[PDB]
Amino acid sequence: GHNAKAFAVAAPGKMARTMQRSSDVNERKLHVPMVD
Amino acid sequence: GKGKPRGLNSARKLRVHRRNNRWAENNYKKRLLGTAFKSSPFGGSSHAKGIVLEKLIRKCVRVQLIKNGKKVTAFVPNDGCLNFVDENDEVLLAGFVRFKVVKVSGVSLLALWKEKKEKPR
Amino acid sequence: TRSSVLADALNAINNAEKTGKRQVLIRPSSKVIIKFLQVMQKHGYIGEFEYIDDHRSGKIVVQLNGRLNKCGVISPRFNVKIGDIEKWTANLLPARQFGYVILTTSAGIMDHEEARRKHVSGKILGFVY
Amino acid sequence: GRMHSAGKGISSSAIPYSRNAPAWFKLSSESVIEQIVKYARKGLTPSQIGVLLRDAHGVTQARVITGNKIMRILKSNGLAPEIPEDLYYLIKKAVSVRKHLERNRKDKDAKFRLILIESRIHRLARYYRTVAVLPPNWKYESATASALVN
RNA sequence: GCGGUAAUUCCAGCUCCAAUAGCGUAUAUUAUGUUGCAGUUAAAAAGCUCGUAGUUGAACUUUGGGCCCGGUUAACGGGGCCUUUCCUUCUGGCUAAACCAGGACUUUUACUUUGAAAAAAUUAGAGUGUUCAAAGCAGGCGUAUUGCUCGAAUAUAUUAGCAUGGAAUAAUAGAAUAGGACGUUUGGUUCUAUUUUGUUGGUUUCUAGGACCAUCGUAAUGAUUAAUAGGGACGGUCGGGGGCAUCAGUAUUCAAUUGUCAGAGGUGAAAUUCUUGGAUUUAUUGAAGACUAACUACUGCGAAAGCAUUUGCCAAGGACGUUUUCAUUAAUCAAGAACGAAAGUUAGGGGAUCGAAGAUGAUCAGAUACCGUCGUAGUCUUAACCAUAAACUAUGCCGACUAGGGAUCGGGUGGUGUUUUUUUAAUGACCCACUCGGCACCUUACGAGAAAUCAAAGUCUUUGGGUUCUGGGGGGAGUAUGGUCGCAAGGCUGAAACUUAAAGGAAUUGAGGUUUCCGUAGGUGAACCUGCGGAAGGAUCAUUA
RNA sequence: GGAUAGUGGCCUACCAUGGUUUCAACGGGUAACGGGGAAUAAGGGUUCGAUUCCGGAGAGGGAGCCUGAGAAACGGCUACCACAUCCAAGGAAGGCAGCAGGCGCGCAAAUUACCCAAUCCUAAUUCAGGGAGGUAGUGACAAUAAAUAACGAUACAGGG
Numbered sequence A: 001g002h003n004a005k006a007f008a009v010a011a012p013g014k015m016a017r018t019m020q021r022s023s024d025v026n027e028r029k030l031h032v033p034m035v036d
Numbered sequence B: 001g002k003g004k005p006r007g008l009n010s011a012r013k014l015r016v017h018r019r020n021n022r023w024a025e026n027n028y029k030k031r032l033l034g035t036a037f038k039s040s041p042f043g044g045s046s047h048a049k050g051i052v053l054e055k056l057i058r059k060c061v062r063v064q065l066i067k068n069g070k071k072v073t074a075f076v077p078n079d080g081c082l083n084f085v086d087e088n089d090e091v092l093l094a095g096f097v098r099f100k101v102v103k104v105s106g107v108s109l110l111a112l113w114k115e116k117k118e119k120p121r
Numbered sequence C: 001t002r003s004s005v006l007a008d009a010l011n012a013i014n015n016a017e018k019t020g021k022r023q024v025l026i027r028p029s030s031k032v033i034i035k036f037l038q039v040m041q042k043h044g045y046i047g048e049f050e051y052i053d054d055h056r057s058g059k060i061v062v063q064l065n066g067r068l069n070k071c072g073v074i075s076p077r078f079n080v081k082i083g084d085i086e087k088w089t090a091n092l093l094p095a096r097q098f099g100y101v102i103l104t105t106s107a108g109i110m111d112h113e114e115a116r117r118k119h120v121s122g123k124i125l126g127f128v129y
Numbered sequence D: 001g002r003m004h005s006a007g008k009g010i011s012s013s014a015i016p017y018s019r020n021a022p023a024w025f026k027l028s029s030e031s032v033i034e035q036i037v038k039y040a041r042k043g044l045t046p047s048q049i050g051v052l053l054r055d056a057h058g059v060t061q062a063r064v065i066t067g068n069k070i071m072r073i074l075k076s077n078g079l080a081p082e083i084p085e086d087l088y089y090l091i092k093k094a095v096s097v098r099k100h101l102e103r104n105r106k107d108k109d110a111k112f113r114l115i116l117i118e119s120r121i122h123r124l125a126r127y128y129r130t131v132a133v134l135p136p137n138w139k140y141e142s143a144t145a146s147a148l149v150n
Numbered sequence E: 001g002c003g004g005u006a007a008u009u010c011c012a013g014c015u016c017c018a019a020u021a022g023c024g025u026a027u028a029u030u031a032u033g034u035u036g037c038a039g040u041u042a043a044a045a046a047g048c049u050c051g052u053a054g055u056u057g058a059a060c061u062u063u064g065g066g067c068c069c070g071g072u073u074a075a076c077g078g079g080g081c082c083u084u085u086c087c088u089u090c091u092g093g094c095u096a097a098a099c100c101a102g103g104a105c106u107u108u109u110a111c112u113u114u115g116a117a118a119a120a121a122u123u124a125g126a127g128u129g130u131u132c133a134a135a136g137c138a139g140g141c142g143u144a145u146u147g148c149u150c151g152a153a154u155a156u157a158u159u160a161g162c163a164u165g166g167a168a169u170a171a172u173a174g175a176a177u178a179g180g181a182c183g184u185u186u187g188g189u190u191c192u193a194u195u196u197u198g199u200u201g202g203u204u205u206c207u208a209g210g211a212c213c214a215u216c217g218u219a220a221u222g223a224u225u226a227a228u229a230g231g232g233a234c235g236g237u238c239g240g241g242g243g244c245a246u247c248a249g250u251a252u253u254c255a256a257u258u259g260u261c262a263g264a265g266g267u268g269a270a271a272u273u274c275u276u277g278g279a280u281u282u283a284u285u286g287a288a289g290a291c292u293a294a295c296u297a298c299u300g301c302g303a304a305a306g307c308a309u310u311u312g313c314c315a316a317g318g319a320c321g322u323u324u325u326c327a328u329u330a331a332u333c334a335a336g337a338a339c340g341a342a343a344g345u346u347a348g349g350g351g352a353u354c355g356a357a358g359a360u361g362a363u364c365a366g367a368u369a370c371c372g373u374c375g376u377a378g379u380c381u382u383a384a385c386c387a388u389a390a391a392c393u394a395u396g397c398c399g400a401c402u403a404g405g406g407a408u409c410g411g412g413u414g415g416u417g418u419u420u421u422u423u424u425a426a427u428g429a430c431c432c433a434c435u436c437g438g439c440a441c442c443u444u445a446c447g448a449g450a451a452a453u454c455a456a457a458g459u460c461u462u463u464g465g466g467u468u469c470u471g472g473g474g475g476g477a478g479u480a481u482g483g484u485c486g487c488a489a490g491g492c493u494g495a496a497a498c499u500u501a502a503a504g505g506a507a508u509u510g511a512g513g514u515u516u517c518c519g520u521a522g523g524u525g526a527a528c529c530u531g532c533g534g535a536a537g538g539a540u541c542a543u544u545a
Numbered sequence F: 001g002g003a004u005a006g007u008g009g010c011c012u013a014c015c016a017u018g019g020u021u022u023c024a025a026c027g028g029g030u031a032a033c034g035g036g037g038a039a040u041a042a043g044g045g046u047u048c049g050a051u052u053c054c055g056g057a058g059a060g061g062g063a064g065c066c067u068g069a070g071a072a073a074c075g076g077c078u079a080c081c082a083c084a085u086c087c088a089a090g091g092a093a094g095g096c097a098g099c100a101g102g103c104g105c106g107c108a109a110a111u112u113a114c115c116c117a118a119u120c121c122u123a124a125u126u127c128a129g130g131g132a133g134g135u136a137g138u139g140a141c142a143a144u145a146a147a148u149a150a151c152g153a154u155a156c157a158g159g160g
Helices: A012-028 B011-024 B026-032 B079-083 B109-113 C005-019 C031-042 C085-091 C112-118 D031-041 D046-056 D070-076 D085-103 D108-131 D142-149
Strands: B048-054 B061-065 B071-074 B090-095 B099-104 C023-026 C048-052 C059-063 C071-073 C100-105 C108-111 C122-128
Touching: A012 B026, A012 B048, B011 B026, B048 B071, B061 B099, B071 B099, B079 B109, B099 B109, C005 C023, C005 C031, C005 C071, C005 C122, C031 C048, C031 C059, C031 C100, C031 C108, C031 C122, C085 C100, C085 C112, C100 C112, C108 C112, D031 D046, D031 D070, D046 D070, D085 D108, D085 D142
Parallel strands: none
Antiparallel strands: B048 B061, B048 B090, B061 B071, B090 B099, C023 C059, C048 C059, C071 C122, C100 C108, C100 C122
């Protein structure tokens, strides 16, 4: 389709730390499903 | 002598050559594309929430992850605390069987092993 | 082709000193090679050199008497500021009580210590120890 | 070594360490000038004036005797051609090999050598047009080169 | 009860150790190369050459000497003079175009020094007992009843712009058709007047300042070498370099004719096959296409692929020799382009041999000793394509230096050296010595390397001559998508998701089949077989020299 | 020429065909506000900088405007889009990326506190106002100093 080189960003480390913290926040929302 | 040019007015060639060549390094590519955390078992996270699916060898349990849905094995330290997880428990796991049980039902396993807290049911 | 006659002269001097020769011949000649060899000769790293005059470029025969470790050029001739001299000195010399780096400044071709004493800086040319 | 070959030969002449007056000559200093221009009027380009002058009349070079080069002497009297000597001979060789290639279409060695000769002509013509002895464009092409050389 | 347990130690008790108002855990990270990586074999030098931009590029033009003053520890550093040397644009004076006080200048740059500047906080840092400290900018001293007083420094700021000193280093321009510089050498054109003839409008002369056209001079009147760089010319060589034409040599197959009998081929052992209309063999002759044996070598030529019969023609080339020419024209190379084994593709040609596919023989534990006959395309060529190889020296190209020896190819130099002339004169061949340019070889380590090994794979932890290309674990994979080229086959570019950590590799020493591959084409038992071309990443003994 | 506070293809009528680029134009991506600064280094580099200061932009998303020296202002106005409040069903009203505070998962994180005393800002103005700002409260962000003991007598174990 296209190249992964072209769809890149200006800051690697900020992506790394914000993405790790956002993954932690997103897995904080997970639960065991039951019925209301 | 060496492969690289060494002119006074040849900084452009060196900079362009370095820019071209850094893409062949694995760390550079996986840190610019943001896909370096898919090789980790957790994904981008450091802990993963899971469902206690079965009690397994004797110390470990079989726990299904809630995010992706695949089932792994979990290490429960202080083998007596094996009986704190019962069935379908909501656990929070960290890497160590490459996994281990850290936080069961919101509270930590060290607060239950030392009888600091009690499990909310 | 020949891009720097000073590099060839210093490579010939280094090889002649390493194999253990007493004197070496250098072709072509230059004013910069003559001045650089005088800068070596003042601190005794070489012996005595003589200029043979054919009409083409001249040749230089240098009589060596030991106590030469390593001499070379730094190509390209970078622009070295007056605070930047000790950076090169620490980068490409073995110690501090021996070893000279050599600069062509607007006051001529001289080693780094005379450049400090005259408070003048310019382009790098090479080194000797 | 060579510009268009792997050869690295050093076969050349060695001019002596004497810029004035070979002692056994004692002939003249200006007679060689009209001898040279008579040879040029005969239809000769400066290389064989030099060769025939050192082979027959004993002049080692015109620089040491007359104090002037042969091409500057011929240009001083207005006998210089439009194109210089070596470019003329390169165009002549290219025209001959192009005629041969026109007769023989399957001579790929002649193709390669024609490309080499034409690139050499391009380099020398660029140098001549930079120093401005040629017209500033001069447009080298084979169709006009065939009429230009002969 | 003992011992063992792929219990990746299964669990509790005693003891000690680390840090401490703090300590642990999970995940991420630390312990690409300008400086400063590697490319023979571990990943990697485009198959080769040309070539634009880019990057890089031989030497050379004022050095040397004397004089003082003159700052700092006999030394280091500064300026003015003279040594043919201080060069320019003008106001005021000493004067008789030649000096003094003064307003200013890199022909154009790059470079470097110095200075203005550049915001506070932050950084470094001076002073100061906030009870110490992190800090903060405070504070300190007295007759402590009318007071006094030190501070709140300093450094840095790495580009671009501004000012300034230097002129090495690296570029650029000037006099070659003199259309060049300089003048109390003269005429003419063309313009403007700060004025005086009362201010002004216009007419003119004188006078003053410019530019221009021709003539007399003033002068050392103006051109750096000619790179063991390059291209060009010339002399004689040299070669299995190329194209066209032509000639020859056996051989293979086929055909004709003649001889004679029972077999000929083939393989480990058979069979199909031809054969008493004569197979095979023998003898004479002819045709077809292909290929150039022996000579053939650790020889030669070409950019590589590659190139071997004779002779002729056409154009080309290397090395040598030259007291020949021009004077930097050069090196490497994105764009772009020429050539490019074999196989393969579209047409025309003849098609001998060999021969993928195919048709057929027997499959006998063992095929170790997996074959036989016929044979299409192809093999050869013309006109167009394709553009890949273990395209290998697995070693880019240009330049220099560094170690001993013997051969050998081409050119050149010397030999009251040899031989053939039929007279010992040129030449040819041989020998000896030297030299330039090659193909390689033997030993060694000055060195290099992880090692095998290397005269470069050396001149490197003491690291810089210029330049191009490539690589940054292995599969997935040169696969998928997109683009471009190709009639196709396919070529160029070129990923990711997932997976391995007892994973991939380089060199050396401690039931059957078994050479390993590469480019290409075709077909299926057992991921194999076969056709063309290429490599060793495979183990040179005996004789002679 | 119009318009502007004013230059200007800012816009209009006419006339030319130009302008940029392999020294990378143009298009695309950016989890891209920029700088002072921060960290790791011996140096070069590499990474971060939403955030105490300076500059820019925005006030749910477009678009337009009044007033005024200064706004294309949103704790100003008008209309469109999306949300959304009130009711007697005719109509009216809205904008926390200000300070508190709440929702956004059924797995969680500061006080809907006090005051203009300080620093400054505003006005007609010493006087009023200021969730700007200060004060206290609150999860060990980070950081500094520092308690939880010191001196003995007696019996054994010692070096003796």
